[PDB]
Amino acid sequence: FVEMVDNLRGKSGQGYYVEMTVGSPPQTLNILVDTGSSNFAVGAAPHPFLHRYYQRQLSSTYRDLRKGVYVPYTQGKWEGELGTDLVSIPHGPNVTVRANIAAITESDKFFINGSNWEGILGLAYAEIARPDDSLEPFFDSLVKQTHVPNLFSLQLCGAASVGGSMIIGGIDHSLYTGSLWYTPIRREWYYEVIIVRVEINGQDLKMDCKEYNYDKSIVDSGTTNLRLPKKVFEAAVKSIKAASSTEKFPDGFWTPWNIFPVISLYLMGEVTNQSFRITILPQQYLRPVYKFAISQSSTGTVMGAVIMEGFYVVFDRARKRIGFAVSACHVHDEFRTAAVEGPFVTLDMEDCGYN
Ligand SMILES: CCc1ccc2c(c1)[C@@H](NC[C@@H](O)[C@@H]1Cc3cccc(c3)CCCCn3cc(ccc3=O)C(=O)N1)CC1(CCC1)O2
């Protein structure tokens, strides 16, 4: 999959994007890779922040669906006009597919002033597509229309320019060390997973595990931070504060690598009563602006770039599971390294999920 290695770019905190083409003749656009949503949407009008935009008038293969659409994310939102067109990924598989495309015609706090992307590729499932689950997401269209296998993987590498790889249809073994460990996708909407235990410096947070997944835990390449439910964030911060008593930092805030604690999330494994743990280092959760990149949520745990930059993450849709392995590009020192380890014995893991 050599041609797909290093096909991701971005600036820190502004997301990771891949080059795509849309229309005939092909119009090149940079498109955010977002496992936390399910719509393919591109700027279609001359917003002043945009380097370029989709011009439907130039495409002979454009088809109008004569239907509006609107997607609000955590912070921004857009509305637009649904249609279909031919799409490919220059540094992806050698194929062209007819996909649904939302042409964005109005937006608020969505495009970023100074960013180098013009659209978003929602890689999650139909259940959360707008306006409804009948709007087939891109990856579903790709798998339907080609022989591309039903999985993709992400190696997000970080550094204020960032880089990475999206391997569509497979796994590049040179991008990770050790073994992949798989956690089940609990339900196909977001990439929802179940966290069964949390350790700060190998010390259990000792919370009811249901709190870790209240109301969701998801894997989201579109989110920068590791986001934790407040009751879990509260307990997480408390322990991180204690762990790091050598120095004091102000309340609002919430290089000496060895002073900061590693954080371990234990994830439901593939077998009854079996889990595994992923562990990140301070170099993952201390990101240059350093800013502390763990935050509160009312919408559950979001394993964003802070988690994903430690690991090669395989979205094995075919088998309804997500794989984690230590990333071959992750930043580490002579002392410590990000880790994926197992098996562990964990009882009542099905009770950790919220209903
Ligand atoms: C289906 C639409 C939708 C609606 C709500 C929503 C989500 C998705 C979940 N995923 C959010 C993710 O899709 C978006 C994508 C995005 C949108 C605009 C810009 C960018 C990314 C790039 C910049 C990344 C910075 N950043 C983006 C988001 C959140 C935090 C954050 O730091 C964001 O909304 N990401 C994340 C959650 C579900 C749990 C919280 O909320």
Short mmCIF file of C-alpha atoms and ligand atoms in Angstrom, two decimals:
data_model
loop_
_atom_site.label_atom_id
_atom_site.label_comp_id
_atom_site.label_asym_id
_atom_site.label_seq_id
_atom_site.Cartn_x
_atom_site.Cartn_y
_atom_site.Cartn_z
CA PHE A 1 0.00 0.00 0.00
CA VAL A 2 3.09 2.19 -0.52
CA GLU A 3 1.21 4.75 -2.61
CA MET A 4 -1.11 5.58 0.34
CA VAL A 5 1.65 6.06 2.96
CA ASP A 6 1.93 9.74 3.94
CA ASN A 7 -1.27 10.76 2.12
CA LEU A 8 -2.48 12.87 5.10
CA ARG A 9 -1.54 16.46 5.95
CA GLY A 10 -2.82 19.19 8.25
CA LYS A 11 -1.89 21.89 10.74
CA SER A 12 -1.97 21.13 14.46
CA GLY A 13 -5.48 21.38 15.90
CA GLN A 14 -7.05 22.02 12.46
CA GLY A 15 -7.61 18.36 11.48
CA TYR A 16 -6.08 15.85 9.09
CA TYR A 17 -6.96 15.98 5.39
CA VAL A 18 -6.57 13.84 2.30
CA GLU A 19 -6.53 14.97 -1.34
CA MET A 20 -9.61 13.94 -3.33
CA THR A 21 -11.05 14.68 -6.74
CA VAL A 22 -14.71 15.31 -7.48
CA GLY A 23 -16.44 15.64 -10.86
CA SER A 24 -15.56 15.22 -14.52
CA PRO A 25 -13.11 16.69 -15.33
CA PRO A 26 -11.66 16.09 -11.84
CA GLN A 27 -11.65 18.97 -9.35
CA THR A 28 -8.97 18.57 -6.68
CA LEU A 29 -9.94 19.34 -3.09
CA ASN A 30 -8.44 18.77 0.34
CA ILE A 31 -10.93 16.93 2.56
CA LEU A 32 -10.88 16.29 6.33
CA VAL A 33 -10.75 12.65 7.39
CA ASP A 34 -13.40 12.31 10.07
CA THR A 35 -14.34 9.04 11.71
CA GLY A 36 -16.76 10.98 13.94
CA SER A 37 -19.34 11.82 11.25
CA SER A 38 -20.93 10.29 8.15
CA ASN A 39 -21.49 12.94 5.49
CA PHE A 40 -19.29 13.80 2.53
CA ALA A 41 -19.58 17.58 2.21
CA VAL A 42 -17.52 20.14 0.26
CA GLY A 43 -17.44 23.93 0.06
CA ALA A 44 -19.36 24.90 -3.09
CA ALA A 45 -19.27 28.69 -2.81
CA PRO A 46 -16.52 31.34 -2.51
CA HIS A 47 -16.24 31.62 1.25
CA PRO A 48 -13.24 33.89 1.93
CA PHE A 49 -11.46 31.28 4.09
CA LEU A 50 -11.49 28.71 1.24
CA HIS A 51 -8.60 28.08 -1.16
CA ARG A 52 -10.99 26.48 -3.59
CA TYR A 53 -14.45 24.96 -3.84
CA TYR A 54 -16.57 22.49 -5.85
CA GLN A 55 -18.02 24.06 -8.98
CA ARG A 56 -20.92 21.84 -9.99
CA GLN A 57 -21.39 23.79 -13.25
CA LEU A 58 -18.05 22.37 -14.53
CA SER A 59 -18.95 18.70 -13.93
CA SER A 60 -20.74 16.69 -16.66
CA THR A 61 -21.26 13.81 -14.18
CA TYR A 62 -22.94 15.95 -11.51
CA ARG A 63 -26.53 14.93 -10.62
CA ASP A 64 -28.81 17.03 -8.43
CA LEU A 65 -30.78 15.21 -5.71
CA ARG A 66 -33.03 18.29 -5.28
CA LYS A 67 -32.82 18.02 -1.50
CA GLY A 68 -31.32 20.24 1.20
CA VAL A 69 -29.15 18.94 4.03
CA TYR A 70 -27.72 20.33 7.25
CA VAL A 71 -25.06 18.93 9.61
CA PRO A 72 -24.14 20.45 12.98
CA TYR A 73 -20.97 19.16 14.66
CA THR A 74 -19.65 19.95 18.17
CA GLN A 75 -18.84 23.57 17.31
CA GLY A 76 -19.67 24.47 13.69
CA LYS A 77 -22.36 23.65 11.17
CA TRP A 78 -23.10 23.84 7.47
CA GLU A 79 -26.08 23.49 5.23
CA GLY A 80 -26.04 22.57 1.61
CA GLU A 81 -27.47 20.89 -1.43
CA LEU A 82 -27.38 17.14 -1.99
CA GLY A 83 -26.25 15.58 -5.24
CA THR A 84 -24.03 12.81 -6.59
CA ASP A 85 -20.80 12.88 -8.59
CA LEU A 86 -17.75 10.78 -9.46
CA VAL A 87 -15.09 10.78 -6.74
CA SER A 88 -11.56 9.40 -6.41
CA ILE A 89 -8.63 9.58 -4.02
CA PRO A 90 -5.37 10.21 -5.96
CA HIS A 91 -3.26 8.63 -3.17
CA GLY A 92 -5.85 5.97 -2.46
CA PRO A 93 -7.04 2.90 -4.37
CA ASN A 94 -7.10 3.14 -8.17
CA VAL A 95 -10.89 3.54 -8.47
CA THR A 96 -13.63 6.07 -9.12
CA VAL A 97 -17.01 5.86 -7.39
CA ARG A 98 -20.35 7.69 -7.59
CA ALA A 99 -20.93 9.16 -4.16
CA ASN A 100 -23.37 11.40 -2.38
CA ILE A 101 -21.94 14.91 -1.96
CA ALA A 102 -23.39 17.77 0.08
CA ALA A 103 -22.47 21.00 -1.72
CA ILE A 104 -22.01 23.45 1.16
CA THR A 105 -23.76 26.75 0.49
CA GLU A 106 -23.93 28.31 3.98
CA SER A 107 -21.89 27.72 7.12
CA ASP A 108 -21.04 28.98 10.56
CA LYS A 109 -17.83 28.29 12.50
CA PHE A 110 -17.13 25.32 10.24
CA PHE A 111 -14.37 26.39 7.84
CA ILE A 112 -11.20 27.50 9.62
CA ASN A 113 -9.51 30.80 8.72
CA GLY A 114 -6.00 29.86 7.59
CA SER A 115 -6.62 26.12 7.11
CA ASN A 116 -5.90 24.23 3.88
CA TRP A 117 -9.05 22.08 3.62
CA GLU A 118 -12.37 22.69 1.85
CA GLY A 119 -14.58 19.76 2.85
CA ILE A 120 -15.16 16.79 5.16
CA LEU A 121 -15.26 13.01 4.60
CA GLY A 122 -17.47 11.38 7.22
CA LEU A 123 -16.21 7.81 7.52
CA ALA A 124 -18.73 6.57 10.16
CA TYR A 125 -22.00 4.73 9.57
CA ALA A 126 -25.33 5.57 7.89
CA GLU A 127 -27.21 5.76 11.25
CA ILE A 128 -25.79 9.25 11.88
CA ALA A 129 -25.83 10.56 8.28
CA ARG A 130 -27.98 13.61 7.62
CA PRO A 131 -30.74 14.16 6.69
CA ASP A 132 -31.32 10.48 7.54
CA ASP A 133 -29.81 6.99 7.32
CA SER A 134 -30.90 6.54 3.68
CA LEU A 135 -28.07 8.86 2.59
CA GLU A 136 -25.34 6.31 1.81
CA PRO A 137 -21.98 7.40 3.24
CA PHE A 138 -18.91 7.51 0.99
CA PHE A 139 -17.18 4.41 2.32
CA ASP A 140 -20.36 2.37 1.93
CA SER A 141 -20.53 3.52 -1.70
CA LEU A 142 -16.82 2.72 -2.23
CA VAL A 143 -17.21 -0.85 -0.92
CA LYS A 144 -20.48 -1.41 -2.86
CA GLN A 145 -19.13 -0.26 -6.23
CA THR A 146 -15.58 -1.68 -6.12
CA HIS A 147 -13.58 -4.62 -4.80
CA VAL A 148 -12.00 -2.42 -2.11
CA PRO A 149 -12.12 -4.44 1.13
CA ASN A 150 -14.40 -3.12 3.87
CA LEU A 151 -11.81 -1.65 6.20
CA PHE A 152 -9.46 1.29 6.48
CA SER A 153 -6.71 2.21 8.86
CA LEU A 154 -5.24 5.44 10.17
CA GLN A 155 -1.72 6.34 11.28
CA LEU A 156 -1.94 9.91 12.58
CA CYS A 157 1.57 11.12 13.24
CA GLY A 158 1.30 14.69 14.55
CA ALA A 159 4.20 17.15 14.17
CA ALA A 160 2.89 23.50 13.09
CA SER A 161 2.34 21.00 10.27
CA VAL A 162 1.14 17.43 10.87
CA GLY A 163 1.14 14.26 8.77
CA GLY A 164 -0.12 10.70 8.55
CA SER A 165 -1.48 7.84 6.48
CA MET A 166 -4.94 6.59 5.60
CA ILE A 167 -4.72 3.09 4.16
CA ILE A 168 -7.95 2.40 2.36
CA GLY A 169 -8.82 -1.27 1.99
CA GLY A 170 -6.03 -2.73 4.08
CA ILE A 171 -3.35 -2.66 6.71
CA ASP A 172 0.27 -1.60 6.16
CA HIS A 173 2.35 -3.62 8.60
CA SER A 174 5.29 -1.23 8.39
CA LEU A 175 3.18 1.42 10.20
CA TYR A 176 3.09 -0.43 13.54
CA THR A 177 5.15 -2.60 15.90
CA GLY A 178 3.97 -5.57 18.01
CA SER A 179 0.46 -6.95 17.56
CA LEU A 180 -2.90 -5.40 16.78
CA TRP A 181 -5.47 -5.85 19.55
CA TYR A 182 -9.10 -5.55 18.66
CA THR A 183 -12.08 -4.06 20.52
CA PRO A 184 -15.63 -4.65 19.25
CA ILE A 185 -17.63 -1.87 17.61
CA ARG A 186 -20.57 -1.90 20.03
CA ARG A 187 -22.91 -0.39 17.50
CA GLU A 188 -22.46 0.87 13.97
CA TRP A 189 -23.27 4.58 14.19
CA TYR A 190 -20.24 6.36 15.49
CA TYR A 191 -17.30 4.02 15.94
CA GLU A 192 -18.52 3.27 19.48
CA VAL A 193 -16.34 1.23 21.83
CA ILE A 194 -16.42 0.28 25.52
CA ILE A 195 -13.77 1.37 28.03
CA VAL A 196 -13.71 -1.08 30.97
CA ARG A 197 -10.92 0.36 33.16
CA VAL A 198 -8.79 3.50 33.44
CA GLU A 199 -5.34 3.83 35.00
CA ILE A 200 -3.16 6.87 35.70
CA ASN A 201 0.42 5.71 36.31
CA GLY A 202 -0.82 2.13 36.64
CA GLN A 203 -3.17 3.13 39.46
CA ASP A 204 -6.87 2.35 38.96
CA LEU A 205 -9.21 5.36 38.99
CA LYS A 206 -11.62 2.99 40.83
CA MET A 207 -14.78 4.39 39.21
CA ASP A 208 -17.84 2.43 38.14
CA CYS A 209 -16.90 1.57 34.56
CA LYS A 210 -20.32 2.73 33.27
CA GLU A 211 -19.13 6.29 33.97
CA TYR A 212 -16.29 5.82 31.43
CA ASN A 213 -18.88 5.29 28.68
CA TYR A 214 -21.61 7.73 29.71
CA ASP A 215 -23.24 8.18 27.32
CA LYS A 216 -20.83 7.02 24.55
CA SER A 217 -17.21 6.29 24.00
CA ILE A 218 -16.09 6.81 20.39
CA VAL A 219 -13.00 6.87 18.19
CA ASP A 220 -12.99 10.23 16.37
CA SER A 221 -10.19 11.43 14.04
CA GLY A 222 -12.14 14.71 13.75
CA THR A 223 -11.54 15.64 17.42
CA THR A 224 -8.23 16.94 18.73
CA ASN A 225 -8.39 16.10 22.43
CA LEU A 226 -9.03 13.10 24.60
CA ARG A 227 -12.47 14.13 25.84
CA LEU A 228 -13.79 12.58 29.09
CA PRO A 229 -17.24 12.72 30.79
CA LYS A 230 -17.04 15.34 33.56
CA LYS A 231 -17.45 12.87 36.43
CA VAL A 232 -14.59 10.90 34.85
CA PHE A 233 -12.72 14.09 33.90
CA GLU A 234 -13.10 15.32 37.47
CA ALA A 235 -11.62 12.05 38.80
CA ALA A 236 -9.05 11.93 36.00
CA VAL A 237 -7.84 15.48 36.66
CA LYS A 238 -7.80 14.85 40.44
CA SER A 239 -5.40 11.90 40.01
CA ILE A 240 -3.30 13.64 37.34
CA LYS A 241 -3.00 16.65 39.68
CA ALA A 242 -1.79 14.32 42.47
CA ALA A 243 0.54 12.37 40.18
CA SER A 244 2.26 15.61 39.12
CA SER A 245 2.85 17.36 42.47
CA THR A 246 6.47 18.39 41.72
CA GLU A 247 5.03 21.57 40.17
CA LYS A 248 1.77 23.54 40.56
CA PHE A 249 -0.47 24.83 37.72
CA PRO A 250 -3.55 27.17 37.94
CA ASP A 251 -7.16 25.86 37.95
CA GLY A 252 -8.14 27.24 34.51
CA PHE A 253 -5.30 25.35 32.80
CA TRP A 254 -6.99 22.07 33.74
CA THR A 255 11.12 19.38 28.58
CA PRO A 256 10.55 17.24 31.73
CA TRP A 257 8.92 14.11 30.27
CA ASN A 258 9.46 11.76 33.21
CA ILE A 259 7.44 13.92 35.66
CA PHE A 260 4.14 13.36 33.80
CA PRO A 261 2.08 10.15 34.23
CA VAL A 262 1.09 7.70 31.47
CA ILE A 263 -2.64 7.13 30.96
CA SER A 264 -4.05 3.67 30.20
CA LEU A 265 -7.47 2.85 28.83
CA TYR A 266 -8.54 -0.76 29.02
CA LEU A 267 -10.87 -1.68 26.18
CA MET A 268 -13.31 -4.60 25.88
CA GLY A 269 -11.49 -7.42 24.08
CA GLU A 270 -12.73 -9.95 21.54
CA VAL A 271 -13.29 -12.76 24.08
CA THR A 272 -15.64 -13.04 27.10
CA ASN A 273 -13.98 -11.58 30.26
CA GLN A 274 -10.89 -10.52 28.19
CA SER A 275 -9.59 -6.96 27.75
CA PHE A 276 -6.47 -5.17 26.62
CA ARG A 277 -4.97 -1.81 27.42
CA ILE A 278 -3.64 1.06 25.39
CA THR A 279 -1.25 3.45 27.11
CA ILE A 280 -0.22 6.92 25.97
CA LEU A 281 2.72 9.07 27.04
CA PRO A 282 2.93 12.77 27.95
CA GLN A 283 4.17 13.51 24.43
CA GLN A 284 0.71 12.52 23.17
CA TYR A 285 -1.33 14.58 25.69
CA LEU A 286 1.11 17.54 25.86
CA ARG A 287 0.61 19.11 22.43
CA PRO A 288 2.51 22.22 21.29
CA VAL A 289 0.42 25.40 20.91
CA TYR A 290 2.35 23.03 25.43
CA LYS A 291 -1.40 22.80 26.00
CA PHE A 292 -3.07 20.11 28.14
CA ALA A 293 -5.33 18.28 25.71
CA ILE A 294 -7.74 16.35 27.96
CA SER A 295 -11.16 18.04 28.41
CA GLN A 296 -14.72 17.57 29.70
CA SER A 297 -17.68 16.27 27.78
CA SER A 298 -21.43 16.09 28.15
CA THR A 299 -21.46 13.74 25.13
CA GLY A 300 -19.19 10.95 26.42
CA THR A 301 -15.60 9.85 25.94
CA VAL A 302 -14.05 10.94 22.65
CA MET A 303 -10.83 9.25 21.76
CA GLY A 304 -9.53 11.98 19.47
CA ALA A 305 -6.07 12.68 18.04
CA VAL A 306 -4.51 12.58 21.56
CA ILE A 307 -5.31 8.86 21.69
CA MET A 308 -4.95 8.12 17.97
CA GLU A 309 -1.48 9.69 17.54
CA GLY A 310 -0.12 6.95 19.87
CA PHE A 311 -1.44 4.10 17.71
CA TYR A 312 -2.11 2.63 14.32
CA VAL A 313 -5.85 2.26 14.34
CA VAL A 314 -7.60 -0.27 12.10
CA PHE A 315 -11.29 0.33 11.40
CA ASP A 316 -12.22 -3.26 10.55
CA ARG A 317 -15.81 -2.64 9.48
CA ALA A 318 -16.02 -6.12 7.91
CA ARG A 319 -15.68 -7.72 11.37
CA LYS A 320 -17.28 -4.92 13.42
CA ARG A 321 -14.08 -4.27 15.37
CA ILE A 322 -11.36 -1.65 15.85
CA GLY A 323 -7.69 -2.60 16.11
CA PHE A 324 -4.97 -0.74 17.98
CA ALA A 325 -1.20 -1.28 17.68
CA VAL A 326 1.73 0.84 18.75
CA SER A 327 2.38 3.32 15.95
CA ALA A 328 5.77 3.19 14.22
CA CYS A 329 5.72 7.03 14.02
CA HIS A 330 4.59 7.94 17.56
CA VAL A 331 6.76 10.33 19.51
CA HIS A 332 8.55 8.79 22.49
CA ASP A 333 11.78 9.05 24.47
CA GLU A 334 14.52 6.64 25.59
CA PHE A 335 12.56 5.99 28.83
CA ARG A 336 8.93 5.28 27.85
CA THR A 337 6.84 4.29 24.83
CA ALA A 338 3.14 4.11 23.98
CA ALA A 339 1.88 0.56 24.54
CA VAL A 340 -0.82 -1.93 23.57
CA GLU A 341 -0.82 -4.89 25.94
CA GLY A 342 -2.92 -7.93 26.82
CA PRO A 343 -4.73 -10.12 27.57
CA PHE A 344 -6.18 -9.04 30.90
CA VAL A 345 -9.00 -10.59 32.92
CA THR A 346 -11.90 -8.15 33.26
CA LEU A 347 -15.32 -9.25 34.58
CA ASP A 348 -18.75 -7.71 33.82
CA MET A 349 -17.49 -5.79 30.76
CA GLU A 350 -20.98 -5.80 29.18
CA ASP A 351 -22.17 -3.80 32.22
CA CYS A 352 -19.74 -0.98 31.31
CA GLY A 353 -21.88 0.14 28.34
CA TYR A 354 -24.66 2.69 28.67
CA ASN A 355 -28.25 1.96 27.53
C1 LIG B 1 -22.63 13.64 12.72
C2 LIG B 1 -22.17 15.03 13.13
C3 LIG B 1 -21.70 15.07 14.59
C4 LIG B 1 -22.48 15.73 15.55
C5 LIG B 1 -22.05 15.78 16.88
C6 LIG B 1 -20.86 15.15 17.26
C7 LIG B 1 -20.07 14.50 16.29
C8 LIG B 1 -20.50 14.45 14.96
C9 LIG B 1 -18.75 13.79 16.71
N1 LIG B 1 -17.64 14.05 15.78
C10 LIG B 1 -17.24 15.46 15.59
C11 LIG B 1 -16.50 15.55 14.25
O1 LIG B 1 -17.34 15.00 13.23
C12 LIG B 1 -16.21 17.01 13.84
C13 LIG B 1 -15.59 17.08 12.43
C14 LIG B 1 -14.93 18.44 12.15
C15 LIG B 1 -15.72 19.55 11.87
C16 LIG B 1 -15.11 20.79 11.62
C17 LIG B 1 -13.73 20.92 11.67
C18 LIG B 1 -12.93 19.81 11.95
C19 LIG B 1 -13.54 18.58 12.19
C20 LIG B 1 -11.41 19.94 12.01
C21 LIG B 1 -10.96 20.64 13.30
C22 LIG B 1 -10.83 19.67 14.48
C23 LIG B 1 -11.03 20.41 15.83
N2 LIG B 1 -12.22 19.88 16.55
C24 LIG B 1 -13.36 19.52 15.83
C25 LIG B 1 -14.48 19.03 16.49
C26 LIG B 1 -14.49 18.88 17.88
C27 LIG B 1 -13.37 19.25 18.62
C28 LIG B 1 -12.24 19.75 17.97
O2 LIG B 1 -11.26 20.05 18.64
C29 LIG B 1 -15.65 18.59 15.65
O3 LIG B 1 -16.80 18.99 15.82
N3 LIG B 1 -15.29 17.62 14.80
C30 LIG B 1 -18.31 14.14 18.15
C31 LIG B 1 -19.56 14.22 19.03
C32 LIG B 1 -20.19 12.85 19.26
C33 LIG B 1 -19.52 12.79 20.63
C34 LIG B 1 -19.22 14.30 20.53
O4 LIG B 1 -20.49 15.22 18.58
#
